[PDB]
Amino acid sequence: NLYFQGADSCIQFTRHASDVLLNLNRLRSRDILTDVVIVVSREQFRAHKTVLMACSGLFYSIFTDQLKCNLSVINLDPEINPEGFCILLDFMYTSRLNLREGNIMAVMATAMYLQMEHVVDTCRKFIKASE
Amino acid sequence: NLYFQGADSCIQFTRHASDVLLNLNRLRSRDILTDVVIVVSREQFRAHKTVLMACSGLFYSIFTDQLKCNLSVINLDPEINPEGFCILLDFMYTSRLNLREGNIMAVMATAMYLQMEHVVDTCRKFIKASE
Ligand SMILES: Cn1c(=O)n(C)c2cc(Nc3cc(N4CCOCC4)ncn3)ccc21
Numbered sequence: 285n286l287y288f289q290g291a292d293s294c295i296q297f298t299r300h301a302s303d304v305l306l307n308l309n310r311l312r313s314r315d316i317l318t319d320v321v322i323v324v325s326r327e328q329f330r331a332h333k334t335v336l337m338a339c340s341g342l343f344y345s346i347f348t349d350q351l352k353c354n355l356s357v358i359n360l361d362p363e364i365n366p367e368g369f370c371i372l373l374d375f376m377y378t379s380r381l382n383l384r385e386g387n388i389m390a391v392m393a394t395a396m397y398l399q400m401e402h403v404v405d406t407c408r409k410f411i412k413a414s415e
Numbered sequence: 416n417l418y419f420q421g422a423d424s425c426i427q428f429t430r431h432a433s434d435v436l437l438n439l440n441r442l443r444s445r446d447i448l449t450d451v452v453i454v455v456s457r458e459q460f461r462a463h464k465t466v467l468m469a470c471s472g473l474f475y476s477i478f479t480d481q482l483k484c485n486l487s488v489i490n491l492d493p494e495i496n497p498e499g500f501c502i503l504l505d506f507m508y509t510s511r512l513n514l515r516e517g518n519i520m521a522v523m524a525t526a527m528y529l530q531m532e533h534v535v536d537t538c539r540k541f542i543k544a545s546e
Pocket residue numbers: 337338339340341342344399400401402438439441442
């Protein structure tokens with residue numbers, strides 16, 4: 285079955301969280317209900333504020349601020365690598381992190397800036413493996 | 416580890432989808448970035464349109480409609496049981512479905528109206544078990 289008896293005796297759906305995330309990524313692909321543009325140098329990325337907040341300490345801080353919560357455009361530090369941001373945005377909507385030898389440093393620096401602790405820790409572990 | 420090599424050779428995070436959903440429910444609890452009120456008889460439920468759309472065929476249809484996508488208030492059919500709606504809204508944000516002998520009929524009728532196929536199928540299976 286697609287469900288099981290949970291620890292609290294309630295029925296839990298095994299694939300529900302991943303199916304929700306898949307549907308949120310489908311909305312992103314079709315630009316449905318996206319409510320912010322993240323600007324990274326000459327690059328623009330449309331997204332859903334709630335997903336960004338759910339994945340990043342920096343976005344959580346920005347969108348819980350009474351002044352910034354209403355902004356439709358967010359400019360990141362111009363030092364941020366757009367490819368590193370793209371890889372992390374894709375991870376937020378899929379659970380899949382496309383780490384490669386050529387992007388791991390940029391991805392790690394971007395995850396540190398975005399306050400994505402588990403991603404930072406994972407990048408550090410993979411870097412340590414080559415060293 | 417909190418990650419594994421996925422089928423596509425990419426690294427996948429095991430708990431990411433459930434952690435995102437947990438954070439979206441935390442935003443709901445604090446009324447952060449909620450952008451719609453669902454009205455069910457004398458009861459009001461605040462939520463995030465994207466989560467509702469990701470979980471329900473009816474909400475997907477409503478919020479992809481050019482006229483309705485902008486509505487901040489959505490009134491459901493007055494025949495809908497508020498407790499059944501509450502149980503389903505909680506399920507959307509948690510993966511946990513609080514089915515009980517006393518609510519299963521209302522939950523099933525509400526899931527049919529909301530076009531939540533897997534929930535409908537599960538209710539039908541549990542009803543069949545007692546019969
Ligand atoms: C540091 N950090 C990190 O690595 N990730 C993945 C983060 C996600 C959030 N996103 C939240 C947090 C949150 N609560 C923490 C604050 O008190 C209220 C509940 N609620 C919703 N969204 C924040 C920081 C993160």
